[PDB]
Amino acid sequence: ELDQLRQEAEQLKNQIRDARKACADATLSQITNNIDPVGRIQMRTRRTLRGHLAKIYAMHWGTDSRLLVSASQDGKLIIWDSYTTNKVHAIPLRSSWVMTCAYAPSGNYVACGGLDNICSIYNLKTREGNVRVSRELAGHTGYLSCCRFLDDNQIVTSSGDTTCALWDIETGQQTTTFTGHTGDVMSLSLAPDTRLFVSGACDASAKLWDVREGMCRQTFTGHESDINAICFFPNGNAFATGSDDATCRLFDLRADQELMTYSHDNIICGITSVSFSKSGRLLLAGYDDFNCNVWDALKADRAGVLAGHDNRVSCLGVTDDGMAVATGSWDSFLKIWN
Amino acid sequence: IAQARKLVEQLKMEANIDRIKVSKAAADLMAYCEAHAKEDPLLTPVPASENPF
Amino acid sequence: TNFAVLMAHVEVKHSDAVHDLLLDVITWVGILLSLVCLLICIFTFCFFRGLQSDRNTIHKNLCISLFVAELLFLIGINRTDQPIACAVFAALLHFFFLAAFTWMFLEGVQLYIMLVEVFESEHSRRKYFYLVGYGMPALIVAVSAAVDYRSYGTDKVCWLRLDTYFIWSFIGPATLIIMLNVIFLGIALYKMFHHTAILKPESGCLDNIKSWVIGAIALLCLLGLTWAFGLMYINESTVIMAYLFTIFNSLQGMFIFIFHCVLQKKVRKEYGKCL
Amino acid sequence: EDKAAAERSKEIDKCLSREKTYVKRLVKILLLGADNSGKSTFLKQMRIIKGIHEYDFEIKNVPFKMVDVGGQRSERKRWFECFDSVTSILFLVDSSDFNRLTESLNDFETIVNNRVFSNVSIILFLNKTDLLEEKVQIVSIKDYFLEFEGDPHCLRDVQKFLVECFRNKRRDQQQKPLYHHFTTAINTENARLIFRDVKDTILHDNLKQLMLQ
After folding, report:
1. At what angle do helices C240-248 and C19-37 cross, to 10 degrees?
2. A53, A117, A202: residue with CB nearest D23
3. Which residues of C touch D26 (CB under 8 A)?
4. Domain count along chain D
5. Which domain holds residue B45?
6. Which of A30, A63, A167, D190, CA to CA, is 20 to 30 A from D23?
7. Domain housing C93
8. Range of the domain at D82
9. Domain holding C16: CATH number?
């Protein structure tokens, strides 16, 4: 019955596969074969941050490219100062299992979450000079894997129970729920216009979501394992993601097709984190081989290896101005490259 | 079941959304590369005189 | 001349003197080879930050004390024509040879800590470790100088004296340390056979001792049990017992480097990362 | 001067230097059981009392943390295995309802064989053992299972049979040992047994360094 229609619309193309083979001329490699390679990229460690006690899972930068926050399994948040290696604030936590961080654009609030299935919002600047818990948002059913800010009074979360949600901080209730997956959700990225966002999954698939209306518009596939990280090209018209199959890929939205693949022959272990650059010419990726690789997006070859971490690299970040690379591994030393 | 109907409706609504040629949607990244190729510090190194940080 | 002079209480008079040359050449070669291998380990234990614990400090301080003592022995033991030099040289040799034995006793203390009181302690003891390894060799020198000070320089060699029984300021503590370090070696040997020959054996008593000959041999270097051979030299026919002292105790840096610095996984990986 | 804020940066560091001796002196063990295992009664009778629950106590001036997961062992993903710093896994299973031993044994096999838990110890608790004497005379173990060779009326034979079946599916040699006991509601000796079974797994790690094997 309906299975035949589903097969006709999926297995028998019907603009889902036929329309894919009606938009590509030969390959983007033909167009890009007229660009000289970037060359050799060598980076060093400028400053090293110490003070944590356990492994590090997440970190986030700031709007001024000067202050950053990071989380550890110890159960503390530290607001650093990359210019002078000085600690400004240290905030304890109620749960020692933490997986996410955030940093409000106005620099007045800090968000956190983990295996307690609850998001916590702390106020930074207030009278009497002390940090205290300001909001405690609960209502999920799985476990949080990513949370981001939109303004001072709106926050978006993604959970491991195959859902995403948007919240109103002032009241404490949800407004829109994005359902419709099969596996867990491991990442989330916000477009640089505060209008849409993109969510990965554990079913080797990714989806693009609209905030206001609240339904999916585009779904992409083409992997064979869990999808780990995701981001945006700094224009709002492309993205790139990696998986546990040790392969990276780049996806578009208007053409609605896969364009570029990044892989090798000695890469057996998978990828953990993905981040882009200012001009989109530097894709930076972290693996569990105690290293961190740099690919040029247009080409499909490496151009730099960032060694120096004794243990597995877990978090990667770039600034807004464009002068930093922040890395955090399973040891307790954040590293800054320039 | 309602799940089959929801899946069929999603497939129908995910097919007639129009498309574009791959070259036209693939030269955009190349154009953006030289659109902001001078403000990227990690790509083109800058003189060290810009403060000791 | 020779190295057994440190642990000798009675003078020896050979005949058809051929053994003195073979007792001096071995001493020279052993000290020269040990001094080289005793400096490569100081950098390993004081520069790398991954290998930092309560056991690296003991090794570091023991190596430093041994290096200073051996250098002083090489430089200042035939300057007999000068009294002022000999007095101070003997005092320095006494201090810097007692410090090494105290740091050797701390190794047995560490073995007891690691194999009986298994759990970590509430408050740190890394400061007390410094008050006992460098505190006792100060009080001992103080009282020794108080009793009789002019007896710091002989007519032939330059250290202590044996007509006034004054060499027993270095022998008594050494033998006490050796006797305590023997009790410690036993507790490890009982634990290594019992536990790993009752928990993961099966039918068959095929000498479990063989599975762990190394490590057991390696601990002999740190515990310093070979020095007892110096006590068994009381006759001209008993040369075979002083012959082995100059063959093993001079070559102590070599063993302590080839067992605890170039035959372990953690140090090998620390070198490989730098490479 | 604005550069006189370093004092604050120092005041934080001291705060993080006083708790460095509390992580090196910490032991964490992970509890696992079943619906009828008896987790609640065992937990409540130890002078101690949505998501993961945590309990903290001390035996002979040594911190101990109990991490309890409520009905979420079905997560077969790999990102959930963040319990790589645990020292022991404590499994609880019943021994009176013979109809549900197969599923429990399969769960035990699945939990042990994972590669992450390769440097941890396994403690086994067989609950009941007080209802087993009053029940074995009416039901024969030869019916539900057919591998038993001993007399199906002596308690020792069935106890050895259960222990052997549980212990014969632990593979990959033996990097760390396995233990087992027989307690239901002692609430006076359970703490001591765990303490004596977690001390040994630290001797078997200390001796490895002092042996070069």
Report:
1. 20
2. A53
3. none
4. 1
5. 1-53
6. D190
7. 4-274
8. 5-210
9. 1.20.1070.10
